[PDB]
From a paper:
Here, we report the high-resolution structure of BrabA.11339.a, a structural genomics target that entered the pipeline as a ‘β-lactamase-like protein’. β-Lactamases break down β-lactam antibiotics such as penicillin and lead to the resistance of pathogens to antibiotics. BrabA.11339.a assumes a metallo-β-lactamase-like fold with two central β-sheets. As a very typical feature of β-lactamase-like proteins and the phosphodiesterase protein family, a two-metal center is present in the active site of BrabA.11339.a. It therefore seems likely that BrabA.11339.a is a GTP/ATP or GDP/ADP hydrolase.
Residue numbers in the entry:
A (entry chain A), B (entry chain A): 3 to 272
Write the structure that this text describes.
């Protein structure tokens, strides 16, 4: 059992369609390597105390959320934190309702105004019962914004998040620093004011979509350039699409850089 | 390879939270029997011609849609048909976009007015590009209504659906007859005018949630009463929650009635 630590689980490391795509397309990925089967991008963040009590926070609830949590072996949840309101990050939100029953209280969710206002449009019934329904709401909303730290309380003690702005094509997404672990998915450029949060990480988890340029995400080469500038002790690539085969990318990257895989798990001091 | 037939695949046979729930709760289900692991409710309907060309239609696109299609081994899709606009039936809709690329045309979707109007609210970006986006739409909407047959064309020939009304607690859901296979999920009562569609089926796929009453779904005992009245040659139970263990329900039900399981597949003449 984990003790006196933060524990991170890469619940999903794929691009928006997953790997393979729904049509069975593996791209250039070796279909025989289980690490190439990729769920939609999400991170589990836990804090364990000396007795093994935990605070549990998920970053994003995409379509794979239920299976991600089942496979993680972690059976409770304190909060959900959102990066941005794209389908692959939000469409599993209904599956929070089991925890609301278990906890006896609304699920605390954290989102910027852009994200919150999109969640209210898509999923209003999770916040307020509509005309003609008897389903109670399930979520309690909290604002977050770049450069404003926030803390989530729970049984293992507080987990302090440091949000910051990312450019994501035509919209903004959030990245987060949690201690000296940084999570940067769905990012095509880093604004200058965000750099303080991303430099000198023990572990930088950074999106690298594919080899070729894309308007909304770093290419592998762009992510590697950022890794060189930001000097993380270790980097883990995420949000990886079907052109990026695990073994191939492992060989192509520096020793301290690896492609992620679903279920990748590590502990750090806190 | 299938030939000269309709082929049905029970893509999912669980209740809205799945089995187990996201918190690892199996209820009374034996966790060691793989048939108790249940995805959200969905049916694949195919028609094969003499040469093995197929028309492929899915009923509902819930959160498990991507994995359901991958595991089915069927790598193309002609249309999606919807029963009603609950989370467990619609929140996988974004994953249709791969097929739009493969087919070179918008995905044809079929829904009643209630369902369509909810899809436009939750998922408007799938129909019309919003302000501030460059993502093209992916869906082409078609109306369906009880007691009005409709046909979907494709490579294997047309598949004719006969929709009908079901009471589902405080809303209406659709059931469908396809030849002499009937699909009745998310139903708490059958209106009189729907009975002609549901009687004398070769296979009746009918929702049975749990043993105890529920406002929105038949209990096992209620579904069995309907099966006795409607005299299907075979019945398959679906939308089954955590109280309903596969082996137990198999023993408790008549010979011609079985609990479903994910991946249950059969062929019938057409
Ligand atoms: N919820 C939502 N998802 C969107 C919108 N526009 C595009 N998407 C979906 O968001 C995902 C974008 O993928 P990305 O490449 O940023 O990982 C795709 O699944 C795409 O179809 C939108 O306006 N709202
Ligand atoms: N999309 C949507 N889902 C709903 C609404 N109200 C409840 N739900 C969800 O729909 C499902 C209802 O489950 P059922 O028992 O009918 O299978 C649950 O996942 C529930 O949280 C709503 O207004 N819209
Ligand atoms: K490497
Ligand atoms: K039986
Ligand atoms: Mn994404
Ligand atoms: Mn995105
Ligand atoms: Mn349902
Ligand atoms: Mn329903
Ligand atoms: Na805990
Ligand atoms: Na770019
Ligand atoms: Na076909
Ligand atoms: Na009832």
């Amino acid at each position: 059992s984990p003790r006196n630590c933060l524990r991170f689980t890469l619940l999903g490391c794929g691009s928006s369609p997953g790997v393979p795509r729904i049509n069975g397309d593996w791209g250039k990925c070796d279909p025989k390597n289980p690490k190439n089967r990729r769920r939609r991008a999400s991170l589990l963040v836990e804090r364990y105390d000396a007795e093994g009590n935990n605070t549990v926070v998920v970053i994003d609830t995409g379509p794979d959320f239920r299976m991600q949590m089942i496979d993680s072996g972690v059976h409770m949840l304190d909060a959900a934190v959102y990066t941005h309101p794209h389908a692959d990050h939000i469409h599993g939100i209904d599956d929070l309702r089991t925890y609301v029953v278990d906890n006896g209280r609304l699920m605390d969710v954290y989102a910027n105004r852009l994200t919150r206002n999109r969640l209210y449009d898509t999923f209003g019934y999770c916040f307020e019962t509509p005309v003609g329904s008897s389903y109670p709401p399930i979520l309690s909303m909290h604002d977050i914004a770049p450069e404003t730290p926030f803390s989530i309380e729970g049984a293992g003690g507080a987990i302090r998040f440091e949000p910051f702005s990312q450019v994501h094509g035509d919209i903004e997404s959030l990245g987060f620093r949690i201690g000296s672990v940084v999570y940067c998915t769905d990012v095509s450029a880093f604004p200058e004011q965000s750099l303080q949060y991303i430099k000198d990480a023990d572990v930088l988890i950074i999106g690298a979509l594919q080899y070729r340029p894309h308007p909304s995400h770093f290419s592998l080469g762009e992510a590697l350039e950022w890794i060189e500038k930001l000097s993380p002790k270790r980097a883990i690539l995420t949000h990886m699409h079907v052109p990026l085969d695990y073994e191939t990318v492992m060989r192509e990257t520096p020793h301290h850089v690896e492609p992620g895989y679903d279920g990748l798990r590590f502990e750090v001091a806190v």
